[PDB]
Design an enzyme around this catalytic site. Structure first.
Site, PDB file in Angstrom:
ATOM      1  N   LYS A  35       0.765  -1.202   0.000  1.00 41.94           N
ATOM      2  CA  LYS A  35       0.000   0.000   0.000  1.00 41.94           C
ATOM      3  C   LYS A  35       0.811   1.273   0.000  1.00 41.94           C
ATOM      4  N   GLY A  40       9.610  -2.310   1.834  1.00 40.38           N
ATOM      5  CA  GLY A  40      10.408  -2.448   3.027  1.00 40.38           C
ATOM      6  C   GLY A  40       9.760  -2.377   4.393  1.00 40.38           C
ATOM      7  N   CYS A  43      10.282  -1.467   9.141  1.00 42.16           N
ATOM      8  CA  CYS A  43      11.686  -1.534   9.404  1.00 42.16           C
ATOM      9  C   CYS A  43      12.533  -0.607   8.572  1.00 42.16           C
ATOM     10  N   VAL A 241       1.391   8.202  33.379  1.00 44.23           N
ATOM     11  CA  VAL A 241       0.964   9.483  32.758  1.00 44.23           C
ATOM     12  C   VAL A 241      -0.571   9.504  32.786  1.00 44.23           C
ATOM     13  N   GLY A 277       4.102   1.164  22.961  1.00 43.20           N
ATOM     14  CA  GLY A 277       4.093  -0.159  22.336  1.00 43.20           C
ATOM     15  C   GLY A 277       3.741  -0.076  20.881  1.00 43.20           C
ATOM     16  N   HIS A 450      42.583 -12.675  19.528  1.00 46.76           N
ATOM     17  CA  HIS A 450      43.070 -11.713  20.528  1.00 46.76           C
ATOM     18  C   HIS A 450      43.740 -10.550  19.784  1.00 46.76           C
TER      19      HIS A 450
HETATM   20  C1  FAD Z   1      53.665  -5.205  16.148  1.00 46.67           C
HETATM   21  C2  FAD Z   1      52.936  -6.502  16.500  1.00 46.67           C
HETATM   22  C3  FAD Z   1      51.571  -6.637  16.348  1.00 46.67           C
HETATM   23  C4  FAD Z   1      50.891  -7.805  16.648  1.00 46.67           C
HETATM   24  N1  FAD Z   1      49.524  -7.894  16.602  1.00 46.67           N
HETATM   25  C5  FAD Z   1      48.930  -9.105  16.917  1.00 46.67           C
HETATM   26  C6  FAD Z   1      47.465  -9.262  16.898  1.00 46.67           C
HETATM   27  O1  FAD Z   1      46.788  -8.245  16.596  1.00 46.67           O
HETATM   28  N2  FAD Z   1      46.909 -10.453  17.248  1.00 46.67           N
HETATM   29  C7  FAD Z   1      47.659 -11.522  17.607  1.00 46.67           C
HETATM   30  O2  FAD Z   1      47.113 -12.616  17.907  1.00 46.67           O
HETATM   31  N3  FAD Z   1      49.006 -11.439  17.680  1.00 46.67           N
HETATM   32  C8  FAD Z   1      49.668 -10.274  17.357  1.00 46.67           C
HETATM   33  N4  FAD Z   1      51.047 -10.205  17.390  1.00 46.67           N
HETATM   34  C9  FAD Z   1      51.814 -11.427  17.779  1.00 46.67           C
HETATM   35  C10 FAD Z   1      51.824 -11.741  19.225  1.00 46.67           C
HETATM   36  O3  FAD Z   1      52.469 -10.599  19.857  1.00 46.67           O
HETATM   37  C11 FAD Z   1      52.553 -13.028  19.549  1.00 46.67           C
HETATM   38  O4  FAD Z   1      52.118 -14.180  18.779  1.00 46.67           O
HETATM   39  C12 FAD Z   1      52.484 -13.342  21.024  1.00 46.67           C
HETATM   40  O5  FAD Z   1      53.018 -12.291  21.881  1.00 46.67           O
HETATM   41  C13 FAD Z   1      53.281 -14.587  21.345  1.00 46.67           C
HETATM   42  O6  FAD Z   1      53.098 -14.977  22.747  1.00 46.67           O
HETATM   43  P1  FAD Z   1      54.184 -15.807  23.600  1.00 46.67           P
HETATM   44  O7  FAD Z   1      53.684 -15.973  24.945  1.00 46.67           O
HETATM   45  O8  FAD Z   1      54.503 -17.069  22.816  1.00 46.67           O
HETATM   46  O9  FAD Z   1      55.589 -15.024  23.484  1.00 46.67           O
HETATM   47  P2  FAD Z   1      55.959 -13.471  23.736  1.00 46.67           P
HETATM   48  O10 FAD Z   1      54.770 -12.559  23.857  1.00 46.67           O
HETATM   49  O11 FAD Z   1      57.052 -13.137  22.755  1.00 46.67           O
HETATM   50  O12 FAD Z   1      56.440 -13.534  25.232  1.00 46.67           O
HETATM   51  C14 FAD Z   1      57.692 -14.188  25.579  1.00 46.67           C
HETATM   52  C15 FAD Z   1      58.200 -13.578  26.896  1.00 46.67           C
HETATM   53  O13 FAD Z   1      59.272 -14.394  27.435  1.00 46.67           O
HETATM   54  C16 FAD Z   1      60.283 -13.446  27.941  1.00 46.67           C
HETATM   55  N5  FAD Z   1      61.505 -14.270  27.971  1.00 46.67           N
HETATM   56  C17 FAD Z   1      62.057 -14.843  26.872  1.00 46.67           C
HETATM   57  N6  FAD Z   1      63.089 -15.625  27.232  1.00 46.67           N
HETATM   58  C18 FAD Z   1      63.184 -15.551  28.574  1.00 46.67           C
HETATM   59  C19 FAD Z   1      64.077 -16.191  29.582  1.00 46.67           C
HETATM   60  N7  FAD Z   1      65.076 -17.033  29.198  1.00 46.67           N
HETATM   61  N8  FAD Z   1      63.868 -15.871  30.840  1.00 46.67           N
HETATM   62  C20 FAD Z   1      62.877 -15.007  31.261  1.00 46.67           C
HETATM   63  N9  FAD Z   1      62.009 -14.424  30.404  1.00 46.67           N
HETATM   64  C21 FAD Z   1      62.143 -14.666  29.062  1.00 46.67           C
HETATM   65  C22 FAD Z   1      60.262 -12.252  26.981  1.00 46.67           C
HETATM   66  O14 FAD Z   1      60.901 -11.121  27.625  1.00 46.67           O
HETATM   67  C23 FAD Z   1      58.757 -12.122  26.803  1.00 46.67           C
HETATM   68  O15 FAD Z   1      58.126 -11.315  27.840  1.00 46.67           O
HETATM   69  C24 FAD Z   1      51.681  -8.988  17.081  1.00 46.67           C
HETATM   70  C25 FAD Z   1      53.066  -8.828  17.222  1.00 46.67           C
HETATM   71  C26 FAD Z   1      53.708  -7.661  16.900  1.00 46.67           C
HETATM   72  C27 FAD Z   1      55.219  -7.574  16.997  1.00 46.67           C
HETATM   73  C1  FAD Z   2      11.262   3.021  15.561  1.00 42.59           C
HETATM   74  C2  FAD Z   2      11.479   1.523  15.387  1.00 42.59           C
HETATM   75  C3  FAD Z   2      12.715   0.940  15.469  1.00 42.59           C
HETATM   76  C4  FAD Z   2      12.862  -0.446  15.311  1.00 42.59           C
HETATM   77  N1  FAD Z   2      14.098  -1.013  15.406  1.00 42.59           N
HETATM   78  C5  FAD Z   2      14.240  -2.345  15.237  1.00 42.59           C
HETATM   79  C6  FAD Z   2      15.578  -2.976  15.258  1.00 42.59           C
HETATM   80  O1  FAD Z   2      16.606  -2.270  15.488  1.00 42.59           O
HETATM   81  N2  FAD Z   2      15.665  -4.328  15.120  1.00 42.59           N
HETATM   82  C7  FAD Z   2      14.547  -5.092  14.903  1.00 42.59           C
HETATM   83  O2  FAD Z   2      14.624  -6.338  14.725  1.00 42.59           O
HETATM   84  N3  FAD Z   2      13.301  -4.563  14.828  1.00 42.59           N
HETATM   85  C8  FAD Z   2      13.076  -3.248  14.984  1.00 42.59           C
HETATM   86  N4  FAD Z   2      11.809  -2.717  14.853  1.00 42.59           N
HETATM   87  C9  FAD Z   2      10.676  -3.571  14.648  1.00 42.59           C
HETATM   88  C10 FAD Z   2      10.521  -3.899  13.233  1.00 42.59           C
HETATM   89  O3  FAD Z   2      10.373  -2.699  12.485  1.00 42.59           O
HETATM   90  C11 FAD Z   2       9.361  -4.880  13.001  1.00 42.59           C
HETATM   91  O4  FAD Z   2       9.455  -6.030  13.930  1.00 42.59           O
HETATM   92  C12 FAD Z   2       9.380  -5.347  11.542  1.00 42.59           C
HETATM   93  O5  FAD Z   2       9.206  -4.258  10.605  1.00 42.59           O
HETATM   94  C13 FAD Z   2       8.148  -6.243  11.320  1.00 42.59           C
HETATM   95  O6  FAD Z   2       8.141  -6.684   9.955  1.00 42.59           O
HETATM   96  P1  FAD Z   2       6.785  -7.223   9.251  1.00 42.59           P
HETATM   97  O7  FAD Z   2       7.194  -7.623   7.903  1.00 42.59           O
HETATM   98  O8  FAD Z   2       6.000  -8.225  10.096  1.00 42.59           O
HETATM   99  O9  FAD Z   2       5.825  -5.903   9.177  1.00 42.59           O
HETATM  100  P2  FAD Z   2       6.059  -4.378   8.773  1.00 42.59           P
HETATM  101  O10 FAD Z   2       7.504  -3.997   8.659  1.00 42.59           O
HETATM  102  O11 FAD Z   2       5.202  -3.531   9.734  1.00 42.59           O
HETATM  103  O12 FAD Z   2       5.415  -4.324   7.308  1.00 42.59           O
HETATM  104  C14 FAD Z   2       4.016  -4.439   7.072  1.00 42.59           C
HETATM  105  C15 FAD Z   2       3.811  -3.904   5.665  1.00 42.59           C
HETATM  106  O13 FAD Z   2       2.509  -4.251   5.155  1.00 42.59           O
HETATM  107  C16 FAD Z   2       1.875  -3.035   4.591  1.00 42.59           C
HETATM  108  N5  FAD Z   2       0.426  -3.313   4.682  1.00 42.59           N
HETATM  109  C17 FAD Z   2      -0.319  -3.549   5.799  1.00 42.59           C
HETATM  110  N6  FAD Z   2      -1.592  -3.894   5.456  1.00 42.59           N
HETATM  111  C18 FAD Z   2      -1.615  -3.915   4.101  1.00 42.59           C
HETATM  112  C19 FAD Z   2      -2.635  -4.167   3.076  1.00 42.59           C
HETATM  113  N7  FAD Z   2      -3.861  -4.547   3.427  1.00 42.59           N
HETATM  114  N8  FAD Z   2      -2.313  -4.086   1.774  1.00 42.59           N
HETATM  115  C20 FAD Z   2      -1.050  -3.708   1.405  1.00 42.59           C
HETATM  116  N9  FAD Z   2      -0.060  -3.476   2.286  1.00 42.59           N
HETATM  117  C21 FAD Z   2      -0.322  -3.543   3.608  1.00 42.59           C
HETATM  118  C22 FAD Z   2       2.459  -1.913   5.403  1.00 42.59           C
HETATM  119  O14 FAD Z   2       2.199  -0.695   4.680  1.00 42.59           O
HETATM  120  C23 FAD Z   2       3.904  -2.374   5.608  1.00 42.59           C
HETATM  121  O15 FAD Z   2       4.669  -2.030   4.473  1.00 42.59           O
HETATM  122  C24 FAD Z   2      11.649  -1.285  15.040  1.00 42.59           C
HETATM  123  C25 FAD Z   2      10.420  -0.661  14.915  1.00 42.59           C
HETATM  124  C26 FAD Z   2      10.294   0.723  15.061  1.00 42.59           C
HETATM  125  C27 FAD Z   2       8.933   1.413  14.933  1.00 42.59           C
END
Ligand code: FAD
Ligand code: FAD
EC number: 1.8.1.4
Lengths: 472, 482
Positions: A35, A40, A43, A241, A277, A450
């Protein structure tokens, strides 16, 4: 000139547009009647999409205009809101996705009929266009996907000018100086927070004792409300209210009292948002004449194949029972039409997540602690705060926790409740877990990357399973 | 404090488990060993706990990636398109570096507090294995402390791999460490190696205003095992952001010049096309390698593999059965979560448990914008193993959350077994890849199907719906929204 179809879908919201597409993909000659001007449903046009856009844009405004960006070495002298432009980004997003559904209908050979659909026989639907022209569809199956509308507040008339529903609130032309929100459910808290970030003085009034609506875990709800209060969002819970007067000077006077009774008071505001509601929409659809009676809340009763009393007429989404959510409607659409084609039909409402897209976010799936107590389930609890999560700490965004509820005897995860950064995305990993019948131990042993927010989900599950997390 | 044994504390200690290293593998292994009821010692040579990851790795890099992304959103088009209007967006680099340092400091202090809470004895010193059941720690004051122990867990981690003839001075020639702490944004930066670390650190400096080129000997960005189509699409996106690449290129030398700048000599990897490029800062990040210096390995008879790793069995025992090794010092992906998981299960094993880890369920993530993340097998791996598979793809441009946020680069690609529908790999390029890949890891742990995932009720509107859609396309042949 009648169209002949296998499946005729009435409504093009998340339930109906997805049901139309899938039915076409399964080989059904498919029509969808809408209608409104665009496809859409609630929603896309006046719901999830415009609200999330304003939540995003308002959050980034707050990050820029407040303390956050300066604390990361991003310096600006003079941050200003351009509300028209913020509304324009919202509008553009809406327009692109509503256009997207029109394309998908063409791509999948779904026939789009514009007009008001009325079921005019067991196997017939008539769409009446705005100029009174008709288009008749003779059809094997009918799928009712007519959705919902705003629930009115008895005695207060919404006019979308100074007394608004969600629809009016998504399109205010300027920031109100003072706003009162009736209903501290998911929609109220999201729209309140938008306007609070943008400069409004905002109070939500709620009859109940908690914010975030039905089924939110009480501890999570309390913690969430405390955080929003610290941001500037005011609440009067346990508050009724009585009425609202539109005044000669354009303002509104709102009369409230304690919910139990007592202490009358009047609060004046520039905009009153009424969001107590939403309710199923079946107006002038032809149900009474077919004998399809509604349940006492206005829903169409259906069986596990989504069939009404008349077995070739079906209903799904906000017009039927269960959570009024877009993902819920979409999945009912899909499985209803799969059923039409002979397949199994299953959805588990216990595995349907809820999300609040505030900052912080809130999200949950399965059972709250209150539900587990009502049911007499013996459970255990694991918790992990985001303040101990490496990604949250690195981002300096550490509010909240993950809370897991598990079964003592089997270690089965029974519910997952998340307050904090990334809740909305994280709850999807939790939904897969509940679908698969995960134990808390299973989740603890996933090799979560991580540093990710998801590690907190892993840790809260470890706490529930083993008794203790690693990092807290 | 019996729980901190620094310089001056040199009485003999008796332990059930002695962990050498306090990185993600070692510190978590220590905590878990104590929680299981072992008398546990962790030995660390550096001034702070938490290893490479916390101090010079994941944490500071992620902080600068997060902050630099925001600078980009503010300083370019994004914020203005949302009606957020700002006069004069200026970079304060000291203040950005300070946010980074603060996060690191709070997390290193966090580990010290956890070691206390769990009664882990922290020995501050250089650990050397001086008998089958003995570790000797030498401290900064020259003193020594003997730990008589039933098990030894080696978690000594990794170091930067040097580039012969190019001396890292952490001034104008930096490793990842120096690049994380630059005093000013360089006008031009060359990065040697286009692996994960290199592209992240490149992108940080590119956002902050540097002109950046990465030079890579192989034909693709993102390191070993990244899916080739994902790598190409990612490269293309980074090129449009302004990050230049010279792939299939070797560096033949570098010279610091009298104007302060550096001339980097390069050729085609196969030979010829000799060329010089000039920069203000040269970042050397060709790789990392296991660190076992002065550990006592030769004396014990623990021989290393040709890449310097310590060989171990499926319980993480070395050839000496009460000596174990985990993390960056053993085979497998050099990743923090990999180290941590090996640590946990190794110590569960010592306590009598099962030891299982499936490396095909270990995700990898690149924390650019867009993010890249994956788990399971790539197309190239499936081809070379002869496995029959099908593909599902879904672009972020068709996802409602991504569209609403105007954050639409990339796709999700799922690889499923042609007959069983079993998910074999998941590959995500776009917003939210890092978080989303954990849903895929969980799926892979169960042996889930594409269908299984397509039928999960993913919340609307979320990025995760794209994950569901790609699985639906792989399972049924078509998604809904594309
Ligand atoms: C720039 C950068 C970005 C990264 N980003 C991510 C990421 O986003 N996600 C992710 O999963 N991984 C990331 N990594 C990799 C992650 O850092 C490593 O895989 C992780 O730290 C390895 O853990 P670990 O416990 O094996 O060794 P390490 O964290 O290298 O720890 C070994 C520790 O043992 C100590 N140690 C060593 N030998 C001795 C000893 N003989 N006696 C006492 N202490 C000792 C060291 O001083 C150190 O503290 C990143 C690495 C770098 C360099
Ligand atoms: C402000 C707001 C925010 C919301 N946020 C979320 C959210 O973040 N996440 C979430 O999951 N849900 C949210 N909802 C709820 C969500 O919008 C509804 O659960 C969802 O739209 C229901 O879908 P539906 O297909 O059953 O009906 P509706 O989306 O209501 O669609 C019904 C359709 O049928 C049409 N229609 C009705 N009768 C007739 C007819 N006789 N002939 C032709 N067409 C007809 C209408 O014009 C409408 O287009 C929100 C709702 C509102 C009001």
């Amino acid at each position: 000139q009648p169209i002949d179809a296998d499946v005729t879908v009435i409504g093009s919201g998340p339930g109906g547009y997805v049901a139309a597409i899938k039915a076409a993909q399964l080989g059904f000659k498919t029509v969808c009647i809408e209608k409104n001007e665009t496809l859409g449903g609630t929603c896309l046009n006046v719901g999830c999409i415009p609200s999330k856009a304003l939540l995003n844009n308002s959050h980034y405004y707050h990050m820029a205009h407040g303390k956050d960006f300066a604390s990361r070495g991003i310096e600006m002298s003079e941050v200003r809101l351009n509300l028209d432009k913020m509304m324009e980004q919202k509008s553009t997003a809406v327009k692109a996705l509503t256009g997207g559904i029109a394309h998908l209908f063409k791509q999948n050979k779904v026939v789009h009929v514009n007009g008001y659909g009325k079921i005019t026989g067991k196997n017939q639907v008539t769409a009446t266009k705005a100029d009174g022209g008709t288009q008749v569809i003779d059809t094997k199956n009918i799928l009712i996907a007519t959705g919902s509308e705003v629930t009115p507040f008895p005695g207060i008339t919404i006019d979308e000018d100074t007394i608004v529903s969600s629809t009016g609130a998504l399109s205010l032309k300027k920031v109100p100086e003072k706003m009162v929100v009736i209903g501290a459910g998911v929609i109220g808290v999201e729209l309140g927070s938008v306007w609070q970030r943008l400069g409004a003085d905002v109070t939500a009034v709620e009859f109940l004792g908690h914010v975030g609506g039905v089924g939110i875990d009480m501890e999570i709800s309390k913690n969430f409300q405390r955080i929003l209060q610290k941001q500037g969002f005011k609440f009067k819970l346990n508050t009724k209210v009585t009425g609202a007067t539109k005044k000669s000077d354009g303002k509104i006077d709102v009369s409230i009292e304690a919910a139990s009774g007592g202490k009358a008071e009047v609060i004046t505001c520039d905009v009153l948002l009424v969001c107590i509601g939403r309710r199923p929409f079946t107006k002038n659809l032809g149900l009474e004449e077919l004998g399809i009676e509604l349940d006492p809340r206005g829903r169409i009763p259906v069986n596990t194949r989504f069939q009404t009393k008349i077995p070739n007429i079906y209903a799904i989404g906000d017009v039927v029972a269960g959570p009024m959510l877009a993902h819920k409607a979409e999945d009912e659409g899909i499985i209803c039409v799969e059923g039409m084609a002979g397949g199994a039909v299953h959805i588990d409402y216990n595995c349907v997540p809820s999300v609040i897209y505030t900052h912080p976010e809130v999200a949950w799936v399965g059972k709250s602690e209150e539900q587990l107590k009502e049911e007499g389930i013996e459970y255990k609890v694991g918790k992990f705060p985001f303040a101990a999560n490496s990604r949250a700490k690195t981002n300096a965004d550490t509010d909240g926790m993950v809370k897991i509820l598990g079964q003592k005897s089997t270690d089965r995860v029974l519910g997952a409740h998340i307050l904090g950064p990334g809740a909305g995305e994280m709850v999807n990993e939790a939904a897969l877990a509940l679908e698969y019948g995960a134990s808390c131990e299973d989740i603890a042993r996933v090799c979560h990357a991580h540093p990710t927010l998801s590690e907190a989900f892993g840790e809260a599950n470890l706490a529930a399973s083993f008794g203790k997390s690693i990092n807290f």
